[PDB]
Structure formats: C-alpha cells, structure tokens
Amino acid sequence: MKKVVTVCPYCASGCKINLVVDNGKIVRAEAAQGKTNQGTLCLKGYYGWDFINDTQILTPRLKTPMIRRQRGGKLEPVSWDEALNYVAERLSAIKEKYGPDAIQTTGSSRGTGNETNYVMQKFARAVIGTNNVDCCARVXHGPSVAGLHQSVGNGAMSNAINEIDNTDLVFVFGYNPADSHPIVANHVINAKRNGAKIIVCDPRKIETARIADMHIALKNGSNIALLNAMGHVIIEENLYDKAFVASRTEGFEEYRKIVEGYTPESVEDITGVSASEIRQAARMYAQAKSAAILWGMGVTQFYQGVETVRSLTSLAMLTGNLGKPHAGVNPVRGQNNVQGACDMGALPDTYPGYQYVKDPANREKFAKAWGVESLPAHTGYRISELPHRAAHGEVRAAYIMGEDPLQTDAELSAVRKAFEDLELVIVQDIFMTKTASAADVILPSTSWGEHEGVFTAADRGFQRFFKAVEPKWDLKTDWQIISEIATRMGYPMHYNNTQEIWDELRHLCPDFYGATYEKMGELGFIQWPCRDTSDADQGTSYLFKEKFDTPNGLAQFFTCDWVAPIDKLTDEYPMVLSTVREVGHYSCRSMTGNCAALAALADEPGYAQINTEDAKRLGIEDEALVWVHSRKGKIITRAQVSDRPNKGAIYMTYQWWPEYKYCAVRVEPIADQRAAEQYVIDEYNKLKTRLREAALA
Ligand SMILES: Nc1nc2c(c(=O)[nH]1)N[C@H]1C(S)=C(S)[C@@H](COP(=O)(O)OP(=O)(O)OC[C@H]3O[C@@H](n4cnc5c(=O)[nH]c(N)nc54)[C@H](O)[C@@H]3O)O[C@H]1N2
Ligand SMILES: Nc1nc2c(c(=O)[nH]1)N[C@H]1C(S)=C(S)[C@@H](COP(=O)(O)OP(=O)(O)OC[C@H]3O[C@@H](n4cnc5c(=O)[nH]c(N)nc54)[C@H](O)[C@@H]3O)O[C@H]1N2
Numbered sequence: 001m002k003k004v005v006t007v008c009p010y011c012a013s014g015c016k017i018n019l020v021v022d023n024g025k026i027v028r029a030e031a032a033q034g035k036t037n038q039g040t041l042c043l044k045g046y047y048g049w050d051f052i053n054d055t056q057i058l059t060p061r062l063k064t065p066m067i068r069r070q071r072g073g074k075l076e077p078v079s080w081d082e083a084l085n086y087v088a089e090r091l092s093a094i095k096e097k098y099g100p101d102a103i104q105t106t107g108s109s110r111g112t113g114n115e116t117n118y119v120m121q122k123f124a125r126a127v128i129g130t131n132n133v134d135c136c137a138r139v140x141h142g143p144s145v146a147g148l149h150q151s152v153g154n155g156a157m158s159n160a161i162n163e164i165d166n167t168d169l170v171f172v173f174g175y176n177p178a179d180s181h182p183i184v185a186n187h188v189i190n191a192k193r194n195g196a197k198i199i200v201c202d203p204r205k206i207e208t209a210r211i212a213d214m215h216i217a218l219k220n221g222s223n224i225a226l227l228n229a230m231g232h233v234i235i236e237e238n239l240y241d242k243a244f245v246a247s248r249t250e251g252f253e254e255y256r257k258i259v260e261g262y263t264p265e266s267v268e269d270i271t272g273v274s275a276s277e278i279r280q281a282a283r284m285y286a287q288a289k290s291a292a293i294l295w296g297m298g299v300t301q302f303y304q305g306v307e308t309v310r311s312l313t314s315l316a317m318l319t320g321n322l323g324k325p326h327a328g329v330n331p332v333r334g335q336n337n338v339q340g341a342c343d344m345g346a347l348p349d350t351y352p353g354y355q356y357v358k359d360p361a362n363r364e365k366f367a368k369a370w371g372v373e374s375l376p377a378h379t380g381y382r383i384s385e386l387p388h389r390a391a392h393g394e395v396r397a398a399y400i401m402g403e404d405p406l407q408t409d410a411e412l413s414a415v416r417k418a419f420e421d422l423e424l425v426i427v428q429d430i431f432m433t434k435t436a437s438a439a440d441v442i443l444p445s446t447s448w449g450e451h452e453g454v455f456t457a458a459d460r461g462f463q464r465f466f467k468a469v470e471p472k473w474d475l476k477t478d479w480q481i482i483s484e485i486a487t488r489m490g491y492p493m494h495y496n497n498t499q500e501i502w503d504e505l506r507h508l509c510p511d512f513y514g515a516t517y518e519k520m521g522e523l524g525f526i527q528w529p530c531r532d533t534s535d536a537d538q539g540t541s542y543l544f545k546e547k548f549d550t551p552n553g554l555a556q557f558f559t560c561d562w563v564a565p566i567d568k569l570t571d572e573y574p575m576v577l578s579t580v581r582e583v584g585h586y587s588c589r590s591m592t593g594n595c596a597a598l599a600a601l602a603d604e605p606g607y608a609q610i611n612t613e614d615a616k617r618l619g620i621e622d623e624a625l626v627w628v629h630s631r632k633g634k635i636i637t638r639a640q641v642s643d644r645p646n647k648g649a650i651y652m653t654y655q656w657w658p659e660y661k662y663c664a665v666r667v668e669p670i671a672d673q674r675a676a677e678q679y680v681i682d683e684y685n686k687l688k689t690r691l692r693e694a695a696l697a
C-alpha cells in the first residue's frame with residue numbers, strides 16, 4: 001500500500017489529494033496538506049476517483065483507437081498504427097490542398113495537464129503551421145480575460161486564494177463558491193472568521209449569503225445598473241482613493257461622467273435594491289482597509305458580461321484595491337486547469353507565458369527553439385467559431401482533444417452539423433462521449449490517475465500531480481499521441497516524460513522559468529511569475545505591486561450604460577431561467593457520473609430550483625417532473641422547490657445529457673407524472689446503450 005500525491009481534476013480550487021494505491025489499483029483517496037485545501041476535500045475529490053476503473057455506469061472509458069471509414073459509419077476498432085497513420089496523412093493532405101489554417105486543434109482544461117497543452121500548441125504552430133489552437137473551457141470567463149486584460153493587463157486572479165482569509169471585506173459577485181469551489185468557500189468563511197465583512201451580490205439566497213454582512217439580491221440582469229450606482233456613491237461621497245486614482249489609473253473622468261446619472265434612487269426598480277442598501281454596500285466596500293472582489297459566470301455569461309467585469313474592476317481601481325495583498329480583482333474560474341491550458345498557450349494569439357505571436361521577437365525565439373524557419377503571426381480561429389468556419393469551408397478538419405462540444409456548446413445541433421460539414425473530425429478523449437461518438441477517428445488517451453504533469457490552480461499556482469496507476473489497456477498520453485502524429489507528418493517529436501516538456505517550455509517562458517519540478521515537489525504551490533530557479537523565488541502571490549501590466553502601466557477605467565437583457569419577459573414566458581452549479585456532480589458528467597458514490601447522488605433528468613411561492617401558483621409540487629417552455633425550447637426537469645431561488649426566476653443546471661444566465665421561459669406542471677418518469681428512464685436508457693453500442697463495437 002502506498003500513497004501517490006495528486007491534484008483534484010474537478011474544479012480550480014487545486015486541492016492536493018493522496019491517492020492510496022494497493023497492488024496496482026487505487027483503493028481510495030484522502031486529502032493531502034496542499035496549500036489551498038490543507039487536509040480538506042469536498043465530495044468530488046473524496047469520492048470522484050472511481051471513474052478510472054471503467055465502471056460503465058454512464059459511458060465506457062476508451063480502450064482502442066477507432067475509425068469510421070464512411071460517414072454512415074460503423075466506428076470500428078483499429079490499431080494505433082492505422083489510426084495515427086490515417087490522421088497524419090489526412091492532415092497532411094488537407095494542409096497541402098487547402099493550407100494549414102484549414103485545420104483546427106483544441107487544448108484541454110481537464111486532467112491531461114499543462115505539458116500536453118504546450119505540445120498541442122507546438123503541434124499546431126511548428127508542425128501544421130497554424131495559430132488555430134484554442135480552449136473551449138476558456139469561456140469559464142472568456143470575457144473575463146480581455147475585459148479584465150484591458151483594465152489591468154492580466155486576466156488572472158490578481159491575488160492568491162490563500163490571501164482571501166485576511167481580507168477586511170469579501171465582495172462576492174455572481175459567484176457561489178459553496179457549490180462551485182468548496183475549498184475556496186472555506187477560505188471565505190475563514191475570512192469572516194478572522195473578522196472580515198462579507199457582501200454577496202446575487203439574486204438567489206446562496207449559502208454564502210447567510211454569513212454575509214449584506215446580501216444584495218439584485219434582479220437577474222441588473223448588473224451594470226447596480227455597479228454604476230455603487231461607483232456613483234463612492235465618488236459622490238468622496239470615498240475613492242485619490243492618490244491611487246491619480247498616480248495609477250486612467251479613465252476616471254469618463255467613468256465619473258457615466259456613473260453620475262446612475263444615482264441609487266434612479267436604479268432602485270431596475271435592481272430591485274433600495275437606494276440605502278446600495279449606498280451602504282458602496283460605503284462598506286469603500287471603507288474597508290483592504291477588500292477583495294471574487295466573481296464567476298453570473299458576470300461573464302451575459303451580453304454585458306465583458307462590461308460587468310471591467311465595471312467591477314473599476315470599483316477596485318476607485319478604491320485602490322489592487323497592487324496589495326488581501327485585496328484584488330479575482331475571477332475564480334471553473335476547471336482544474338483552465339488556467340494552465342491558457343498559461344500553456346492553447347489560445348490562438350499567444351505562445352505559452354503570454355508571449356503574443358504577433359511579436360516578431362517572440363516568433364524568432366520560438367521558431368529558433370523549434371528548429372523551424374517561420375512561425376505564423378496572425379491569430380488563429382477560436383473553437384467557438386467552428387460551426388461557422390466549417391459551414392463556409394474555411395476549416396476542413398477539427399482535432400478535438402479533451403472537449404465535449406456535442407454536449408457542452410450552445411445549441412448542440414449547430415456543432416452536430418459542423419461535424420457534418422468538416423471533412424475530418426478526430427476526437428481524443430478518455431470516454432465515449434457524445435462528441436467522440438460523432439467522430440471519424442477516436443484516439444484514446446490516459447486519464448488523470450494514469451499519468452503525471454502540472455496543473456495551474458485558479459490563482460495561477462502551479463502544482464504537480466503524480467501517476468498513481470498504470471493504464472490497463474494500450475493507451476498513450478495525449479502528448480505521446482500528438483508527438484507521434486507530428487513525427488509521421490515529418491516533424492521529429494518525442495518526449496520520455498512530462499519533465500522533458502516542462503523544462504523545454506520553462507526555457508522559452510521567462511515568467512515560468514523558476515518553477516522547476518523540484519521546487520513544486522509533492523506539495524509546493526508555485527504561483528507565476530516565478531523567474532529565478534533559486535529557492536528564494538517561490539512565485540508571486542499578488543500581481544501589480546509596482547505597475548499595472550497595461551501598455552503604459554496604468555489600469556484603465558470603464559463602465560457603460562445598463563442595457564436590459566435581450567429576452568423580454570412576456571405574459572407567455574414570465575420567468576427568468578438561469579443555470580447554476582451543485583456539488584456531487586461535475587459539468588461534463590463523464591467522470592462524476594462514472595463514480596459509483598457520486599452517481600448515487602444525482603438524479604435524471606436533473607433539478608430546477610423553483611421558488612416556493614412560484615411553484616404554488618403554477619401548481620408545481622416538489623420532486624415533480626416539469627415542463628420548461630421557451631421559443632423552440634421545451635425541457636423536462638424535476639422541481640426542487642425552495643425559498644432559495646428568487647421569485648420570478650428558475651435555476652436549472654446544465655450538467656445533464658451568449659446570455660446563458662438569463663432566458664425567458666414558462667414552467668408548467670405535468671399531470672401524467674408516471675408517463676413523464678418512464679419517458680426519462682426511456683431516453684436515458686436510449687443514450688446509454690447508444691454510447692455503449694459505439695464503444696463496445
Ligand atoms: N452551452 C454552453 N457552453 C459553454 C458553457 C456553458 O455553460 N454552456 N461554459 C463554458 C465553460 S465555463 C466551460 S468549463 C466549457 C466546458 O466544456 P468542455 O471544455 O467540453 O469541458 P468538459 O465537458 O469538461 O470536457 C472535457 C472532456 O475531456 C475529457 N478528458 C478528461 N480528462 C482527459 C484527458 O486526460 N485527456 C483527454 N484527451 N480528454 C480528457 C473528458 O472525458 C471530457 O470529455 O464550455 C464553455 N462553453
Ligand atoms: N460542483 C461543481 N462545481 C463546479 C462545476 C461543476 O460542474 N460542479 N463546474 C466548474 C466550472 S467549469 C465553472 S465555469 C464554475 C461555474 O461556477 P460559478 O462561477 O459559481 O457559476 P454559477 O454557479 O453557474 O453562477 C454563479 C452565481 O451567479 C448568480 N447570478 C446569476 N445571474 C446573476 C446576475 O445577473 N448578477 C449577479 N450578481 N449574480 C447572478 C447565480 O445565482 C449563481 O449563484 O463552477 C465550477 N465548479
């Protein structure tokens with residue numbers, strides 16, 4: 001019996017886990033003394049390791065490569081040699097004929113690791129010769145990045161997760177850590193425990209709200225309105241940090257100009273918050289010696305999402321809550337490694353280390369390092385643009401690794417036809433997902449407990465995770481697959497281990513250079529920038545101490561006018577629909593749902609939080625399956641009646657097989673519940689056998 005140290009592959013909290021191995025199998029998992037979790041794990045880290053053993057509760061783990069040698073296809077098992085040769089040849093042929101930009105590749109924000117993301121972007125750039133690399137996941141706060149990037153020059157959490165504990169005030173906005181990042185919620189509770197004030201801006205009465213000094217339950221979608229009003233009060237009452245605004249920012253006057261009209265009274269009906277509440281929240285935020293803002297999707301998944309991010313960052317600027325510890329602007333994003341995949345350059349406009357491909361010097365260094373004449377300089381296509389690029393014949397092949405767009409992208413039928421429009425779709429995954437079943441070629445890889453690497457936690461903290469068990473089938477790591485394809489296409493690539501990949505990149509990225517494997521060790525948490533390999537350099541806790549990373553080093557102010565959501569509530573669709581998380585289960589459902597204990601927790605079709613009062617009116621009972629109506633939309637879900645959601649809006653999840661946070665719908669009860677249940681079991685059985693029939697063939 002031995003314990004192998006790893007990092008949770010669920011959410012970005014970065015909890016260290018000791019996987020206990022006995023014989024050649026993982027026996028159980030227990031918390032380790034990581035930087036962030038310090039001996040605590042939530043339900044998913046504790047029980048979510050089971051999926052590695054191919055339980056088949058939902059879908060089987062991929063065991064062999066496959067090729068569908070005819071669109072009306074029999075996806076048939078094949079040797080690695082046939083798969084790899086097939087891909088390298090198709091890609092070469094597509095490239096020569098239509099050009100490198102005719103192929104699209106994806107990074108992956110899950111259990112694969114940073115190293116393989118560096119290998120895929122290298123593959124796209126040095127081998128195919130395109131900048132078409134991108135992560136879907138990087139919509140975990142896609143808007144956050146550039147939005148935040150224009151205000152501050154860096155889209156990362158400005159301060160450490162561990163710095164939260166000592167904030168004087170936590171400003172939670174469109175963020176529900178209790179379900180989303182359990183271990184980060186603990187840091188917030190500990191902050192309150194150390195004596196911090198807490199303000200929660202959220203429509204729903206989430207867990208955090210109950211410990212909050214002030215719960216600002218604004219109306220779904222009234223974001224910029226309240227934000228402008230708060231900025232208004234802060235300036236009106238002279239609560240801003242003038243010295244800071246003068247020496248470190250730009251844009252005050254134009255911001256001030258706009259927020260002027262946004263008096264608290266003027267926005268009481270739009271936000272549904274009383275002016276005194278607004279003023280009080282604004283003063284509490286302004287009065288705190290140090291305040292930290294944490295946000296999530298309730299900010300980004302809105303048309304005015306990108307605006308709200310910059311609008312919040314402005315409050316932080318106004319109050320000089322940047323450049324010091326226990327403060328900051330902190331988008332706590334989703335996946336265990338959404339941060340890493342970005343840090344590794346799995347983006348169409350930067351090499352790893354946030355070294356823009358548009359810089360001739362950056363290209364010179366990389367092209368030299370990669371032993372290549374020229375590296376493309378123009379931005380690549382974004383994975384979100386696939387349907388469109390495929391339809392118009394601009395991208396002829398998609399190399400999708402560790403993503404499930406045929407389950408996760410909006411209006412999935414769109415991606416089904418893109419797949420239909422593409423000449424070739426390669427899907428490299430760990431499970432027979434809906435996306436994998438639609439592919440032309442499946443390339444099976446190792447999973448999280450079967451390989452090693454590094455992940456970057458929510459706050460840019462690099463961490464090592466180790467291989468705890470061998471794959472039981474003939475699998476290759478994602479980077480071995482890409483490397484061999486690269487080699488068969490004429491570009492020599494092979495690595496003996498992930499440290500070979502890491503050291504290579506360390507040498508090509510100044511801000512990552514000091515974070516050696518040794519420094520990270522089994523429990524080191526090293527936040528970049530980490531420039532010197534010397535033990536004296538343990539990383540950077542908070543960003544912007546001296547300057548701001550914007551071209552002229554000053555943060556940039558911004559807000560705009562509040563604009564009501566696109567979905568007009570009607571007498572026909574009187575309710576607002578918004579999605580939300582819940583522990584137990586995790587996004588894609590492929591891992592969480594293939595764990596015996598976790599699958600026991602989540603029911604099909606899944607819940608829809610409905611407000612006690614709303615339900616009564618509509619004649620909807622708790623646990624009762626229900627109908628949710630929209631334009632060209634009707635979904636069946638189980639009602640979870642409660643006082644938590646706010647009257648007028650229902651909150652479903654999406655972890656079941658664009659202004660995503662606001663949608664006008666009409667919830668209606670079901671009479672023949674028994675005919676509804678059977679329908680659900682029926683559809684679920686159908687999909688399950690489908691995927692099974694695809695893999696087990
Ligand atoms: N409609 C809609 N679209 C969205 C969002 C939304 O909420 N709604 N949100 C955005 C956000 S925040 C996110 S997080 C994304 C999420 O969407 P995706 O990026 O698709 O994320 P997952 O669905 O978690 O898919 C990860 C896949 O990688 C596979 N995988 C896991 N480990 C490995 C590995 O080691 N190797 C390989 N090759 N594969 C592996 C898993 O089995 C799974 O199939 O979508 C974004 N776009
Ligand atoms: N258990 C579990 N945890 C997860 C995941 C999972 O699948 N399961 N997925 C991970 C991933 S990939 C992601 S992207 C994150 C997403 O997690 P979060 O960023 O926490 O996002 P949600 O819970 O979807 O929405 C956050 C909050 O925004 C609030 N909100 C909605 N509309 C508004 C608004 O108009 N204004 C304001 N102020 N608030 C609003 C909602 O009530 C909700 O409480 O979770 C991650 N953690």
Ligand code: SF4
Pocket residue numbers: 008009010011012013014015037040041042043044045046181182183184
């Ligand atoms: S908080 Fe997140 S990273 Fe930690 S054990 Fe739970 S799912 Fe894993």
Ligand SMILES: [Mo+4]
Pocket residue numbers: 137139140333334335
């Ligand atoms: Mo996400």
